[PDB]
From a paper:
The second patient ([name]) also showed major cardiac involvement and fibrils were purified from the cardiac tissue which became available to us due to heart transplantation. In the case of the [name] fibril protein, it was not possible to determine the sequence of the precursor LC by cDNA sequencing and its amino acid sequence as well as its posttranslational modifications (PTMs) were determined here at the protein level using MS. Comparison of the mutant patients’ sequences with the non-mutated GL segments led to the identification of six amino acid changes in the fibril proteins of patients FOR005 and FOR103, and fourteen in the fibril protein from patient [name]. Analysis of the isolated fibrils with platinum side shadowing and scanning electron microscopy (SEM) shows that [name] amyloid fibrils are left-hand twisted, similar to FOR005 fibrils. The dominant fibril morphology from each sample was structurally reconstructed to a spatial resolution of 2.92 Å (FOR103) and 2.25 Å ([name]), based on the 0.143 Fourier-shell correlation (FSC) criterion. The reconstructed three-dimensional (3D) maps were fitted with molecular models that depict polar and C1-helical fibril structures that consist of single stacks of fibril proteins or protofilaments, similar to FOR005 fibrils. The swirl is defined by the position of the central arc of the amyloid key relative to the N- and C-terminal ends of the polypeptide chain. The swirl of the key is right-handed in the FOR005 and FOR103 fibril proteins when oriented as shown in Fig. 3b, and left-handed in the [name] fibril protein. There is only one mutational change in the analysed fibril structures that would intuitively be anticipated to favour the observed fibril protein fold. This mutation (H96L) affects a buried position of the [name] fibril, where it replaces a charged residue with a hydrophobic one.
Systemic AL amyloidosis is one of the most frequently diagnosed forms of systemic amyloidosis. The disease arises from the misfolding and aggregation of monoclonal antibody light chains (LCs). All fibrils contain a stable core that is formed by two segments of the LC sequence. These segments extend roughly from residue 10 to residue 50 and from position 60 to position 110 and harbour the fibril cross-β structure.
Residue numbers in the entry:
A (entry chain C), B (entry chain B), C (entry chain A), D (entry chain D), E (entry chain E), F (entry chain F): 13 to 49, 61 to 106
Amino acid sequence: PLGQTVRITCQGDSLRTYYGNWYQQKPGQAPLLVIYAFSGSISGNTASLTITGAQAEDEADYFCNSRDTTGNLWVFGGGTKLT
Amino acid sequence: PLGQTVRITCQGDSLRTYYGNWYQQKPGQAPLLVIYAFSGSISGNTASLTITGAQAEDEADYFCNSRDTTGNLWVFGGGTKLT
Amino acid sequence: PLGQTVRITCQGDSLRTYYGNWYQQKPGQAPLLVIYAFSGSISGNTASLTITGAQAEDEADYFCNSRDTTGNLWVFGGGTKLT
Amino acid sequence: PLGQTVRITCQGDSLRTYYGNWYQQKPGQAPLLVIYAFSGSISGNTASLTITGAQAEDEADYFCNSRDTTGNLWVFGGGTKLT
Amino acid sequence: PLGQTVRITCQGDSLRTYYGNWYQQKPGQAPLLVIYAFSGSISGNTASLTITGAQAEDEADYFCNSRDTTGNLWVFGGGTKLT
Amino acid sequence: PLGQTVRITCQGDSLRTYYGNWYQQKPGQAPLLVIYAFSGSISGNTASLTITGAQAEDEADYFCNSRDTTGNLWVFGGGTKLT
């Protein structure tokens, strides 16, 4: 029995608040599963931002708090009652 | 029994609030599953933003909190009562 | 028994609030499953935005909180009562 | 029984508050699973930001606090009652 | 029984507050699992930032406090009651 | 029984507050698991920052305080009641 498991809960950036400009170049997010085997530019853009009044009375955030049961072959997830 | 499992709950950015300009270049999000085997530009754009009054009394956020049961071959998910 | 499983709950960006301009170049979101085997531009656009009064008394958000049972061959999902 | 497990709860940056400009080049986030085996530029952009009034009375944040049960072959997750 | 386990709770930077400009070049975040086996530039960008009024009465942050049970072969996670 | 375990709770920088400019070059964060076996530049950028009023009455931070049970072969995590 051979198996190759990759569990990633978030491949990304996790924020409660972002004010401003975000220049982002993230070419690859592609899982390549193989059993037998970027000149992109962000250029000359103008970004003008002004936040004068902001009130954020927010409640709690729950990001990437997983409860999974992952693997290969026999996987029993959650409150599996087995007899 | 061979198997190759990739479980990703979010491949993306997770935010409660974003104010502003987002320049984003994310070419690849394609899982390639193979058993036997970008000159794009964002350029010269003008972005003018002004938020004067903002009130955000928001409630809680639950992002990417999975409960899955993933794998290959035998997978029993949730409260599977087995006898 | 061989099998190749990719489970992705979100391939995308997950937000409660976005105010502003979003320049987005995401060429590929295509799962390619093969057993035997972008000069696009966003340019010169003008974006003028002004939010003066905003009140957002919102309730809770539940994003990408999956409960799936995924795999190959034998998959028993949810509260499968088996005897 | 051979197996190769990679569990990553967050591959990304985790913040409660970000004010400002973010130049980000993150080419690779692609798990490559193989049993037998970037000239991109952010250039000349202008970013003008001003936050005058900000009040953020926010509640608690729970980022990347996973409860998973990951692996290969036999995986029993959560409060599995086994007899 | 051979197995190779890598458990990383955060591969990223974890902050409660960030004010300013972030130039970031992080090419590789790709777990490569193999059983048998960057000229990118951020250049000439102008970043102007001014935060005059900021009040942040925030609540507690819980970052990367995992409770997982990870490994290869037999993995029993959480309060598994076994008899 | 052979196994090779790497448990890293944070591969990243952990801060409560950051004011200023961050030039960051972190090429590699990729766990390479193999059983049988960067000319990037940040150059000429201008960063202007001014924080005049800042008040941060924040609550406690809990960063990288894990409770995991990691390994290879037999792993029993949390308050596993075994008989």
